[PDB]
Design a protein around this ligand. Structure first.
Ligand code: FES
Length: 100
């Protein structure tokens, strides 16, 4: 039932407004946002820090490539946007490092 290629609608709730774009299912959220000209926080780009943190509001992600968040944090909706792939349409609140 699965497509050979897919993308998903990403809605980012950023400090300067909501923005939306299609993200390939094999491109990380951060990278796809940047390709669309959206400036999001980051540092390591390796899944091992707090800089790119966001909160997942709607939908589902694959965060196998992240390491810094613990299992409880993942269960509570934390996202490292540099290391997350969408597996559905998603809504993510960005710029959330301060809440960790
Ligand atoms: S920029 Fe460090 S985990 Fe994403």
């Amino acid at each position: 039932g699965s497509p050979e290629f897919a993308a998903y609608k990403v809605t980012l709730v950023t400090p300067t407004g909501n923005v939306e774009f299609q993200c390939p299912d094999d491109v990380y959220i951060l990278d796809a946002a940047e390709e669309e000209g959206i400036d999001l926080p980051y540092s390591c780009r390796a899944g091992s820090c707090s800089s790119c943190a966001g909160k997942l509001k709607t939908g589902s992600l694959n965060q196998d490539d992240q390491s810094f968040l613990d299992d409880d944090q993942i269960d509570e909706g934390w996202v490292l946007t540099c290391a997350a792939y969408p597996v559905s349409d998603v809504t993510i609140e960005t710029h959330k490092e301060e809440e960790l």
